[PDB]
Amino acid sequence: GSVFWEPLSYFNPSTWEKADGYSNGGVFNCTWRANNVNFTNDGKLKLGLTSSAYNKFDCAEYRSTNIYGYGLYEVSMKPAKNTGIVSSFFTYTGPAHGTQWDEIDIEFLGKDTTKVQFNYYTNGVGGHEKVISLGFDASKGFHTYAFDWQPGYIKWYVDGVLKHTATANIPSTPGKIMMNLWNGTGVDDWLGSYNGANPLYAEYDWVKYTSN
Ligand SMILES: [Ca+2]
């Protein structure tokens, strides 16, 4: 169908918004700052994790102003490497647009950038985690990650290769496209403990959403 092709060359307020001045609270141990949303000279979204106060942490999230439905989502990215942090790409609808909570994820646990974590939420329920081995260290360069979201399945790919398939209670509300980098608290078993290492950066080259 129709193709949304976002090359992330500069901030376009019509299509994107920078989260700012707040914290998601919970496992999220940092405050979203618009100042942490940058663009490189060669057109990369540069998400930055800083400490602008002794044990205070500044993090970053970029998200779509519009909403999207079924189809192919691809991203070319380069995650941060560190204990206690997540770099991600996901779809998201919750009460955000006064609905139930539906979500599709691609998460890189900074403690082990040699792996990826797939997962999804359907009406607030998750626990669909799937960890796969990359065969490479994600943090060294840009690679291509995607999910094909249709009404009866989700399919995850890496550099073009089917890695995972999900068939049950597949989400169905449309949602926004989101990218964020953050340090977790009291999920250590999951993310490892964050040692305050900073600044940390996650990089995005482009996003493409292909409808139908
Ligand atoms: Ca680009």
mmCIF file of C-alpha atoms and ligand atoms in Angstrom:
data_model
loop_
_atom_site.group_PDB
_atom_site.id
_atom_site.type_symbol
_atom_site.label_atom_id
_atom_site.label_comp_id
_atom_site.label_asym_id
_atom_site.label_seq_id
_atom_site.Cartn_x
_atom_site.Cartn_y
_atom_site.Cartn_z
ATOM 1 C CA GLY A 1 0.000 0.000 0.000
ATOM 2 C CA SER A 2 1.122 3.524 0.990
ATOM 3 C CA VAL A 3 4.613 4.024 2.343
ATOM 4 C CA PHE A 4 5.644 6.266 5.228
ATOM 5 C CA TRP A 5 9.358 6.891 4.631
ATOM 6 C CA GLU A 6 11.034 8.790 7.475
ATOM 7 C CA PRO A 7 14.704 9.497 6.917
ATOM 8 C CA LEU A 8 15.216 11.282 10.246
ATOM 9 C CA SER A 9 17.169 14.148 8.719
ATOM 10 C CA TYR A 10 15.716 16.829 10.938
ATOM 11 C CA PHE A 11 12.972 17.425 13.444
ATOM 12 C CA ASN A 12 9.635 17.707 11.694
ATOM 13 C CA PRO A 13 7.050 18.791 14.210
ATOM 14 C CA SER A 14 4.134 17.799 11.969
ATOM 15 C CA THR A 15 4.981 14.139 12.109
ATOM 16 C CA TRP A 16 6.990 13.780 15.321
ATOM 17 C CA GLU A 17 7.010 14.981 18.883
ATOM 18 C CA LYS A 18 9.787 14.875 21.476
ATOM 19 C CA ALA A 19 8.743 13.709 24.952
ATOM 20 C CA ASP A 20 9.811 16.333 27.561
ATOM 21 C CA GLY A 21 9.811 17.362 31.204
ATOM 22 C CA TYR A 22 8.479 14.102 32.703
ATOM 23 C CA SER A 23 9.061 10.560 33.817
ATOM 24 C CA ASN A 24 7.108 7.474 33.043
ATOM 25 C CA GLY A 25 7.881 6.508 36.631
ATOM 26 C CA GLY A 26 7.945 2.770 37.535
ATOM 27 C CA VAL A 27 10.941 0.842 36.110
ATOM 28 C CA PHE A 28 11.888 4.055 34.333
ATOM 29 C CA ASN A 29 14.565 5.799 36.326
ATOM 30 C CA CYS A 30 14.913 8.982 34.251
ATOM 31 C CA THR A 31 13.167 12.064 32.967
ATOM 32 C CA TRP A 32 12.427 12.543 29.278
ATOM 33 C CA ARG A 33 14.162 15.678 27.933
ATOM 34 C CA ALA A 34 13.615 17.256 24.575
ATOM 35 C CA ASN A 35 17.231 18.270 24.707
ATOM 36 C CA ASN A 36 18.247 14.660 24.473
ATOM 37 C CA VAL A 37 16.675 14.323 21.032
ATOM 38 C CA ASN A 38 19.291 15.169 18.451
ATOM 39 C CA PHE A 39 20.114 14.741 14.736
ATOM 40 C CA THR A 40 23.600 14.000 13.435
ATOM 41 C CA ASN A 41 25.091 15.831 10.498
ATOM 42 C CA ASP A 42 24.551 12.878 8.278
ATOM 43 C CA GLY A 43 20.972 12.457 9.246
ATOM 44 C CA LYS A 44 20.711 10.144 12.213
ATOM 45 C CA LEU A 45 18.237 10.465 15.143
ATOM 46 C CA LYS A 46 20.582 10.598 18.143
ATOM 47 C CA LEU A 47 18.792 9.606 21.399
ATOM 48 C CA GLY A 48 20.948 10.536 24.418
ATOM 49 C CA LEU A 49 21.142 9.301 28.051
ATOM 50 C CA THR A 50 22.746 11.786 30.426
ATOM 51 C CA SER A 51 23.142 12.707 34.090
ATOM 52 C CA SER A 52 22.588 16.387 34.508
ATOM 53 C CA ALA A 53 22.649 16.078 38.285
ATOM 54 C CA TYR A 54 24.602 13.724 40.570
ATOM 55 C CA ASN A 55 22.194 10.819 40.741
ATOM 56 C CA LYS A 56 19.687 12.361 38.404
ATOM 57 C CA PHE A 57 19.265 10.912 34.918
ATOM 58 C CA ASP A 58 18.065 12.487 31.669
ATOM 59 C CA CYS A 59 16.691 10.179 28.949
ATOM 60 C CA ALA A 60 14.977 10.343 25.556
ATOM 61 C CA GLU A 61 11.925 9.352 23.645
ATOM 62 C CA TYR A 62 10.659 10.272 20.133
ATOM 63 C CA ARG A 63 7.201 9.442 18.939
ATOM 64 C CA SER A 64 4.749 9.694 16.115
ATOM 65 C CA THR A 65 2.018 12.349 16.022
ATOM 66 C CA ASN A 66 -0.126 9.997 13.911
ATOM 67 C CA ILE A 67 -1.259 6.441 14.265
ATOM 68 C CA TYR A 68 -0.614 3.395 12.157
ATOM 69 C CA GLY A 69 -2.218 -0.039 11.658
ATOM 70 C CA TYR A 70 -1.354 -3.355 10.019
ATOM 71 C CA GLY A 71 1.671 -3.662 7.826
ATOM 72 C CA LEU A 72 5.421 -3.751 7.684
ATOM 73 C CA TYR A 73 7.553 -1.744 10.104
ATOM 74 C CA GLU A 74 11.259 -1.468 9.452
ATOM 75 C CA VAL A 75 13.933 0.499 11.156
ATOM 76 C CA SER A 76 17.618 0.729 10.669
ATOM 77 C CA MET A 77 19.323 1.256 14.026
ATOM 78 C CA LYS A 78 22.259 1.121 16.366
ATOM 79 C CA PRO A 79 21.531 0.474 20.085
ATOM 80 C CA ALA A 80 23.467 1.583 23.171
ATOM 81 C CA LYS A 81 25.707 -0.804 25.106
ATOM 82 C CA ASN A 82 25.669 -0.709 28.892
ATOM 83 C CA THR A 83 24.330 -2.518 31.904
ATOM 84 C CA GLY A 84 20.884 -1.399 33.077
ATOM 85 C CA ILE A 85 19.536 0.230 29.927
ATOM 86 C CA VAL A 86 17.083 -0.438 27.081
ATOM 87 C CA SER A 87 17.159 0.888 23.482
ATOM 88 C CA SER A 88 13.949 0.255 21.638
ATOM 89 C CA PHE A 89 11.598 0.623 18.658
ATOM 90 C CA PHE A 90 7.945 -0.098 19.145
ATOM 91 C CA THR A 91 4.326 0.551 18.444
ATOM 92 C CA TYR A 92 2.147 1.815 21.208
ATOM 93 C CA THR A 93 -1.445 2.528 22.013
ATOM 94 C CA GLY A 94 -2.887 2.750 25.443
ATOM 95 C CA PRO A 95 -5.056 5.322 27.019
ATOM 96 C CA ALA A 96 -2.827 7.432 24.749
ATOM 97 C CA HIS A 97 -5.742 7.482 22.363
ATOM 98 C CA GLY A 98 -8.284 6.401 24.930
ATOM 99 C CA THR A 99 -8.031 2.671 24.230
ATOM 100 C CA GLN A 100 -6.769 -0.551 25.849
ATOM 101 C CA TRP A 101 -3.102 -1.222 25.948
ATOM 102 C CA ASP A 102 -1.667 -2.747 22.779
ATOM 103 C CA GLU A 103 2.073 -2.856 22.028
ATOM 104 C CA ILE A 104 4.738 -4.430 19.700
ATOM 105 C CA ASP A 105 8.423 -4.300 20.612
ATOM 106 C CA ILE A 106 12.031 -4.524 19.544
ATOM 107 C CA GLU A 107 14.289 -4.119 22.576
ATOM 108 C CA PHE A 108 18.003 -4.272 22.990
ATOM 109 C CA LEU A 109 19.075 -4.891 26.601
ATOM 110 C CA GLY A 110 22.296 -2.882 26.835
ATOM 111 C CA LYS A 111 23.907 -5.540 29.044
ATOM 112 C CA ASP A 112 24.006 -7.864 26.001
ATOM 113 C CA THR A 113 23.880 -6.205 22.567
ATOM 114 C CA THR A 114 24.595 -9.564 21.028
ATOM 115 C CA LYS A 115 20.930 -10.397 21.463
ATOM 116 C CA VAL A 116 17.509 -8.863 20.754
ATOM 117 C CA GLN A 117 14.281 -9.144 22.729
ATOM 118 C CA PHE A 118 10.936 -9.456 20.968
ATOM 119 C CA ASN A 119 7.580 -9.006 22.823
ATOM 120 C CA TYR A 120 3.917 -7.787 22.577
ATOM 121 C CA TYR A 121 1.057 -6.457 24.707
ATOM 122 C CA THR A 122 -2.599 -7.113 23.981
ATOM 123 C CA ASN A 123 -5.091 -5.561 26.390
ATOM 124 C CA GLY A 124 -2.411 -4.977 29.008
ATOM 125 C CA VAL A 125 -1.187 -8.524 28.902
ATOM 126 C CA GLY A 126 2.313 -9.473 27.916
ATOM 127 C CA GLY A 127 4.873 -11.987 28.894
ATOM 128 C CA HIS A 128 5.647 -12.919 25.316
ATOM 129 C CA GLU A 129 9.321 -12.256 25.505
ATOM 130 C CA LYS A 130 11.567 -13.909 23.051
ATOM 131 C CA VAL A 131 15.284 -13.538 23.097
ATOM 132 C CA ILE A 132 17.352 -14.349 20.046
ATOM 133 C CA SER A 133 21.043 -14.374 19.226
ATOM 134 C CA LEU A 134 22.218 -11.908 16.657
ATOM 135 C CA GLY A 135 25.366 -13.661 15.609
ATOM 136 C CA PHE A 136 26.795 -10.152 15.753
ATOM 137 C CA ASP A 137 27.136 -7.273 18.188
ATOM 138 C CA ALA A 138 24.288 -4.804 17.429
ATOM 139 C CA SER A 139 26.112 -1.867 18.931
ATOM 140 C CA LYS A 140 28.878 -1.907 16.315
ATOM 141 C CA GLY A 141 26.824 -0.844 13.328
ATOM 142 C CA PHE A 142 23.451 -0.274 11.756
ATOM 143 C CA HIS A 143 21.274 -3.253 10.995
ATOM 144 C CA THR A 144 17.724 -3.645 9.890
ATOM 145 C CA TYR A 145 14.979 -4.745 12.147
ATOM 146 C CA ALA A 146 11.340 -5.178 11.327
ATOM 147 C CA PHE A 147 8.019 -6.743 12.285
ATOM 148 C CA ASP A 148 5.201 -7.618 9.889
ATOM 149 C CA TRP A 149 1.909 -6.859 11.710
ATOM 150 C CA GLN A 150 -1.175 -8.542 10.291
ATOM 151 C CA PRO A 151 -4.442 -9.515 11.939
ATOM 152 C CA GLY A 152 -3.416 -13.046 12.771
ATOM 153 C CA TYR A 153 0.361 -12.854 13.253
ATOM 154 C CA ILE A 154 3.436 -10.819 13.977
ATOM 155 C CA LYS A 155 6.671 -11.629 12.267
ATOM 156 C CA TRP A 156 10.073 -10.455 13.350
ATOM 157 C CA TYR A 157 13.023 -10.092 11.030
ATOM 158 C CA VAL A 158 16.624 -9.245 11.224
ATOM 159 C CA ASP A 159 18.598 -8.091 8.238
ATOM 160 C CA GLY A 160 15.852 -9.643 6.193
ATOM 161 C CA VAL A 161 15.690 -13.077 7.960
ATOM 162 C CA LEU A 162 12.529 -14.381 9.698
ATOM 163 C CA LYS A 163 13.516 -14.869 13.298
ATOM 164 C CA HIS A 164 10.249 -15.175 15.190
ATOM 165 C CA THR A 165 6.547 -15.666 14.735
ATOM 166 C CA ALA A 166 3.633 -14.959 17.030
ATOM 167 C CA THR A 167 0.114 -16.128 16.426
ATOM 168 C CA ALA A 168 -1.993 -15.653 19.591
ATOM 169 C CA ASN A 169 -4.090 -12.689 20.668
ATOM 170 C CA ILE A 170 -2.297 -10.439 18.212
ATOM 171 C CA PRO A 171 -2.995 -6.745 18.994
ATOM 172 C CA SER A 172 -5.364 -4.771 16.831
ATOM 173 C CA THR A 173 -5.699 -1.162 17.800
ATOM 174 C CA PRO A 174 -3.544 1.216 15.841
ATOM 175 C CA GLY A 175 -0.839 3.105 17.640
ATOM 176 C CA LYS A 176 2.059 5.487 17.489
ATOM 177 C CA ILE A 177 5.611 4.724 16.452
ATOM 178 C CA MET A 178 8.054 5.137 19.321
ATOM 179 C CA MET A 179 11.780 5.145 19.931
ATOM 180 C CA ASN A 180 13.370 5.699 23.422
ATOM 181 C CA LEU A 181 16.533 5.024 25.481
ATOM 182 C CA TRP A 182 16.364 4.587 29.307
ATOM 183 C CA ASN A 183 17.907 3.208 32.577
ATOM 184 C CA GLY A 184 15.836 0.769 34.627
ATOM 185 C CA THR A 185 15.329 0.508 38.424
ATOM 186 C CA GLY A 186 14.576 -2.680 40.303
ATOM 187 C CA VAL A 187 14.408 -4.894 37.213
ATOM 188 C CA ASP A 188 18.043 -5.769 37.616
ATOM 189 C CA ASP A 189 17.312 -9.423 37.197
ATOM 190 C CA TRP A 190 16.078 -8.348 33.727
ATOM 191 C CA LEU A 191 18.330 -5.400 32.735
ATOM 192 C CA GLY A 192 21.315 -5.705 35.010
ATOM 193 C CA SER A 193 22.167 -2.839 37.378
ATOM 194 C CA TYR A 194 22.797 0.556 35.917
ATOM 195 C CA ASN A 195 26.128 1.861 36.942
ATOM 196 C CA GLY A 196 25.487 5.486 35.983
ATOM 197 C CA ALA A 197 27.653 5.179 32.855
ATOM 198 C CA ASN A 198 26.990 8.207 30.664
ATOM 199 C CA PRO A 199 26.537 9.709 28.296
ATOM 200 C CA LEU A 200 25.022 6.867 26.274
ATOM 201 C CA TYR A 201 23.541 7.085 22.793
ATOM 202 C CA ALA A 202 21.257 5.011 20.610
ATOM 203 C CA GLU A 203 21.145 5.806 16.894
ATOM 204 C CA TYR A 204 18.447 5.681 14.251
ATOM 205 C CA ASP A 205 18.971 6.044 10.470
ATOM 206 C CA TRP A 206 15.472 5.649 9.080
ATOM 207 C CA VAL A 207 11.972 4.281 9.602
ATOM 208 C CA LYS A 208 9.634 2.923 6.920
ATOM 209 C CA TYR A 209 5.983 1.928 7.397
ATOM 210 C CA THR A 210 4.433 0.038 4.482
ATOM 211 C CA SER A 211 0.691 -0.315 4.623
ATOM 212 C CA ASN A 212 -1.797 -3.173 4.169
HETATM 213 CA CA CA B 1 18.856 9.043 7.796
#
